[PDB]
Design a protein around this ligand. Structure first.
Ligand SMILES: CCNc1ncc2cc(-c3ccc(N4CCCC4=O)c(F)c3Cl)c(=O)n(CCOCCN)c2n1
Ligand SMILES: CCNc1ncc2cc(-c3ccc(N4CCCC4=O)c(F)c3Cl)c(=O)n(CCOCCN)c2n1
Lengths: 297, 280
């Protein structure tokens, strides 16, 4: 049972010493998921992110299994990719690409993004979603916190532990999975749902880019769930500040009718993306976010 | 140097032997060990109070426990600075957690009443001192080999995902309201349901769904309400009132008739024996 799922996790990870391939371990953060380090590939110089986890103390090992399996099977330039993993006794070490630009959350909460920068971020995220959905993977937890940026402005999606794999005989899910403020109404109300819930969450992330927060953030998560179920498509504070094409893009992401809501493939053709600036335009925002997050300290 | 007032001067490596690791937490590493002069088993938590955020709260918490001991709270013994590590020494309760008993035995109402009474005595003590425990649940109730029942301590982001289910939390907690001591009475009611049903409520629910159910239904639905006596069901109703003013206080519930069917605490030691056999 519980020992069974533990041995199932252990069987998919090679037994070895992470110190033979990686060096320069330096701690950058601690979560309930474990300790996160940066490190360096000793042969190539690649900087990597390594999370250290005590399996004896992980609550939901089945989730770790799913995330590792999904990452191994779905590599893509717009995803924070899995590199390697190691079993060290009762410790699991997971090696991922390292994104030195920080999270999109730091940018949206500390800067003003123009529509060309927002369009660039949206296009990179839609490229990841088109790839994932074409492979029957639904992320279900899209938010700025799970978008990481490279020092060159690259944009990549991370944190797949809430994801779902759909199949022909089970092409929809029904569970209230996600982070409340970003969840689509059909998820909040426990209706059958599919990949377009990620498109809804992307729409909420575009509201983050415009306003600095998802709708209802000042409310408790349960109250926010109630507001999503009862309001449906959220209101912008100042819609008149948006271009006509940006408003149309938002409307298509946040459509209540799932049939009418855009697919990732469809939204990659939207006129709004054609005003996208090059990804280098994001590096001044990264610099501002880093400065701001050292002055809040 | 308030630390010096709470730190004994001896060498704990001389005073204790047979160190055995039994867990790793965010607060530090917990070992079992034995007093070399008396044979008492102890639990020792090792924490590097080396600029760990908000060390003063950890320090003051220790100060509070030394001055405010209680028969139904795990007794604090001593603490030592061992190379800028703080070792906190507690009595060890070798009967294990209530969780192991609940999952490996079926408790009868007399055994449940006894556990509830002992926990209510601890809560009356804490509440009289304006302490809210906030985590009354089966893995924080420890059992002695004589059937003693004790709480392990005083209780010590909107943007983040919920991974586990806070099944013990009162509705006023989950709705992020200001709350008081009676949230512990709610959690006790949930634990009594756990004891009679063998598992915590909401086990098959997603955390967000369980949060909504707690906020709106309040009490979880009993799986088999017909199996509970009238007096036990009334006790549960008094613990699980949604109206905070109507919910019983610890002092009030210590007078409830359900507690008067309590078996002697010795009746718990066969449960401990079963749990150890089942988990070994
Ligand atoms: C912002 C600094 N740059 C950065 N660049 C990459 C990562 C990768 C990761 C990561 C993701 C996933 C797993 N995986 C995959 C299998 C199970 C598992 O845990 C992992 F090990 C790791 Cl290290 C991570 O956490 N962080 C910390 C910040 O993350 C924000 C979202 N929480 C990262 N930060
Ligand atoms: C069931 C095995 N028996 C047992 N018998 C006693 C304890 C005492 C303790 C403890 C309590 C409190 C502090 N204190 C007091 C001041 C700050 C602090 O940390 C402490 F250090 C320690 Cl060691 C502890 O942890 N555990 C591990 C299991 O606990 C379950 C709940 N998590 C114990 N197990």
């Amino acid at each position: 049972s519980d020992e069974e799922i533990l041995e199932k996790l252990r069987s998919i990870v090679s037994v070895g010493d992470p110190k033979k391939k990686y060096t320069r371990f330096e701690k950058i953060g601690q979560g309930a998921s474990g300790t996160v380090y940066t490190a360096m590939d000793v042969a190539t110089g690649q900087e990597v992110a390594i999370k250290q986890m005590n399996l004896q103390q992980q609550p939901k090992k089945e989730l770790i299994i799913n995330e590792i399996l999904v990452m191994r099977e779905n590599k893509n330039p717009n995803i924070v990719n899995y590199l390697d993993s190691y079993l060290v006794g009762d410790e699991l070490w997971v090696v991922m690409e390292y994104l030195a630009g920080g999270s999109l959350t730091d940018v949206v909460t500390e800067t003003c993004m123009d529509e060309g920068q927002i369009a660039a971020v949206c296009r990179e995220c839609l490229q990841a979603l088109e790839f994932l959905h074409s492979n029957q993977v639904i992320h279900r937890n899209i938010k700025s916190d799970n978008i990481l940026l490279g020092m060159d402005g690259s944009v990549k999606l991370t944190d797949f532990g809430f994801c779902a794999q759909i199949t022909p005989e089970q092409s929809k899910r029904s569970e209230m999975v996600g982070t409340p403020y970003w969840m689509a109404p059909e998820v909040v109300t426990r209706k059958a749902y599919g990949p377009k819930v990620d498109i809804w969450s992307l729409g909420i992330m575009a509201i983050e880019m415009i306003e600095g927060e998802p709708p209802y953030l000042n409310e408790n998560p349960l109250r926010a769930l109630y507001l999503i179920a009862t309001n449906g498509t959220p209101e912008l504070q100042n819609p008149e500040k948006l271009s006509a094409i940006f408003r149309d893009f938002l409307n298509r992401c946040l459509e209540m009718d799932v049939e009418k809501r855009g697919s990732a493939k469809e939204l990659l053709q939207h006129q709004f993306l054609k005003i996208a600036k090059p990804l280098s335009s994001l590096t001044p925002l990264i610099a501002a976010a880093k400065e701001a997050t050292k002055n809040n300290h």
